[PDB]
Amino acid sequence: MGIIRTCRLGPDQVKSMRAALDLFGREFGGVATYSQHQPDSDYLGNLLRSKTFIALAAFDQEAVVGALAAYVLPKFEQARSEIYIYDLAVSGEHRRQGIATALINLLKHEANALGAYVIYVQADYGDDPAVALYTKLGIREEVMHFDIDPSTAT
Amino acid sequence: MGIIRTCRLGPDQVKSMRAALDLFGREFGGVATYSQHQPDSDYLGNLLRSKTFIALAAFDQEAVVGALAAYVLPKFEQARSEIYIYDLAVSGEHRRQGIATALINLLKHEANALGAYVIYVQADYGDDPAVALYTKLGIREEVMHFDIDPSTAT
Numbered sequence: 250m251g252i253i254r255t256c257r258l259g260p261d262q263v264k265s266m267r268a269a270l271d272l273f274g275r276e277f278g279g280v281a282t283y284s285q286h287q288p289d290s291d292y293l294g295n296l297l298r299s300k301t302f303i304a305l306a307a308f309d310q311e312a313v314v315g316a317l318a319a320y321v322l323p324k325f326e327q328a329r330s331e332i333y334i335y336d337l338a339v340s341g342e343h344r345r346q347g348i349a350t351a352l353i354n355l356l357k358h359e360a361n362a363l364g365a366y367v368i369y370v371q372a373d374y375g376d377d378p379a380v381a382l383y384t385k386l387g388i389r390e391e392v393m394h395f396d397i398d399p400s401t402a403t
Numbered sequence: 404m405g406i407i408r409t410c411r412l413g414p415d416q417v418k419s420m421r422a423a424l425d426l427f428g429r430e431f432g433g434v435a436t437y438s439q440h441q442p443d444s445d446y447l448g449n450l451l452r453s454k455t456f457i458a459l460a461a462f463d464q465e466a467v468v469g470a471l472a473a474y475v476l477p478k479f480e481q482a483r484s485e486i487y488i489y490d491l492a493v494s495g496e497h498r499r500q501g502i503a504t505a506l507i508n509l510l511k512h513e514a515n516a517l518g519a520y521v522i523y524v525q526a527d528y529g530d531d532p533a534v535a536l537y538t539k540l541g542i543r544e545e546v547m548h549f550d551i552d553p554s555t556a557t
């Protein structure tokens with residue numbers, strides 16, 4: 250065991266996508282957010298069918314032990330793409346084994362296939378594993394982010 | 404004059420989109436990035452046709468004096484959407500007149516129409532106007548961001 254295989258999920262792999270989401274739940278400690286109100290199978294299908302969403306999964310045999318959810322941003326200034334890693338998680342029982350790194354690597358192959366010139370991801374202050382991983386793999390910038398409630402539309 | 408009208412651009416408005424991009428160029432001081440290698444009309448059409456890209460523009464009569472480029476992120480954990488402001492600019496000759504605010508407001512109407520529960524935007528340290536605008540309009544978080552070269556795929 251410990252034969253890890255990485256792939257980009259298609260619309261035929263809703264079962265594996267749901268397992269990625271539970272992984273996300275367990276590992277982000279948001280079991281409710283990620284497992285208890287999942288979309289219907291059509292919704293996931295439509296995600297997985299799309300050219301601008303990428304779901305990557307790592308399998309130790311049958312179980313999903315790593316996943317990565319990204320979005321492709323076709324840019325408007327020029328005919329070029331950027332990729333935005335939204336979420337990335339490896340099973341606690343499978344860390345420091347290169348799975349995250351391999352999913353990013355896989356992601357780079359998808360990017361190359363798409364002609365996307367860059368991939369980016371955001372990390373939180375204190376998320377030290379994530380910060381190390383992306384610092385090893387990327388160029389860091391510190392920035393601000395703001396949420397806005399659309400409720401207040403006038 | 405100074406009658407400003409805000410709208411979400413459709414695929415019939417490639418001419419106005421190109422003007423948004425020049426605005427972006429002039430105002431971000433990236434005239435090359437934004438004006439000199441624009442996509443072909445089809446590419447823009449396809450952007451403007453899409454349900455997951457939003458281009459908002461403000462017009463003082465015929466000229467574009469404000470624009471906003473966002474992406475809709477249909478989420479995977481749950482059947483819900485988030486909106487990501489990528490770029491936002493108001494003509495230097497038209498600032499502090501509520502145009503940015505009105506484009507965001509417009510954006511909130513689009514979000515509501517989409518069922519999207521939040522909108523977010525990133526700002527740079529020292530971009531004081533932007534920081535004030537989003538601080539007035541949003542809840543700030545400080546975070547890191549990392550670019551990764553897909554070139555190194557192995």
Ligand SMILES: CC(C)(COP(=O)(O)OP(=O)(O)OC[C@H]1O[C@@H](n2cnc3c(N)ncnc32)[C@H](O)[C@@H]1OP(=O)(O)O)[C@@H](O)C(=O)NCCC(=O)NCCS
Nearest residue numbers: 336337338339344345346347348349350378379381382385
């Ligand atoms: C971060 C996470 C994905 C790491 O996955 P991983 O497979 O263990 O990472 P890899 O083993 O492929 O590579 C780890 C590399 O990143 C860094 N790193 C990973 N875990 C680390 C840790 N615990 N402490 C310090 N650095 C760490 C190191 O550079 C390491 O390279 P090295 O072992 O040669 O020094 C996982 O532990 C996790 O908690 N996921 C959720 C975190 C997250 O970012 N969520 C929000 C979405 S981005």
Ligand SMILES: CC(C)(COP(=O)(O)OP(=O)(O)OC[C@H]1O[C@@H](n2cnc3c(N)ncnc32)[C@H](O)[C@@H]1OP(=O)(O)O)[C@@H](O)C(=O)NCCC(=O)NCCS
Nearest residue numbers: 490491492493498499500501502503504532533535536539
């Ligand atoms: C930031 C920018 C969009 C402002 O547009 P604007 O129409 O002038 O903003 P509005 O007039 O609608 O509202 C401005 C509000 O934000 C803040 N603000 C705007 N300009 C400001 C400035 N120069 N200094 C301080 N605060 C400022 C204030 O809260 C103000 O509210 P108030 O006048 O009641 O105090 C524009 O000046 C610009 O430079 N665009 C590019 C910046 C950018 O963010 N680019 C990267 C993509 S996010």
Ligand SMILES: CN[C@@H]1[C@@H](O)[C@@H](O[C@@H]2[C@@H](O)[C@H](O[C@H]3OC(CN)=CC[C@H]3N)[C@@H](N)C[C@H]2N)OC[C@]1(C)O
Nearest residue numbers: 277334335336370371372373376395396521523546
């Ligand atoms: C509340 N505001 C939000 C803002 O936090 C941001 O969320 C980022 C998101 O991509 C990823 O979140 C995951 O990671 C972690 C640990 N870091 C916990 C929860 C996970 N989902 C991650 N790459 C970094 C996040 N900052 O954008 C969306 C938002 C709504 O604005």
Ligand SMILES: CN[C@@H]1[C@@H](O)[C@@H](O[C@@H]2[C@@H](O)[C@H](O[C@H]3OC(CN)=CC[C@H]3N)[C@@H](N)C[C@H]2N)OC[C@]1(C)O
Nearest residue numbers: 367369392431488489490524525526527530549550
């Ligand atoms: C180089 N790394 C990049 C990283 O900077 C980030 O760019 C953000 C982008 O949305 C918007 O940029 C605009 O604003 C400004 C002034 N702030 C200058 C150039 C404009 N295009 C803005 N909201 C904040 C940016 N930080 O993401 C993409 C990226 C490739 O990773």
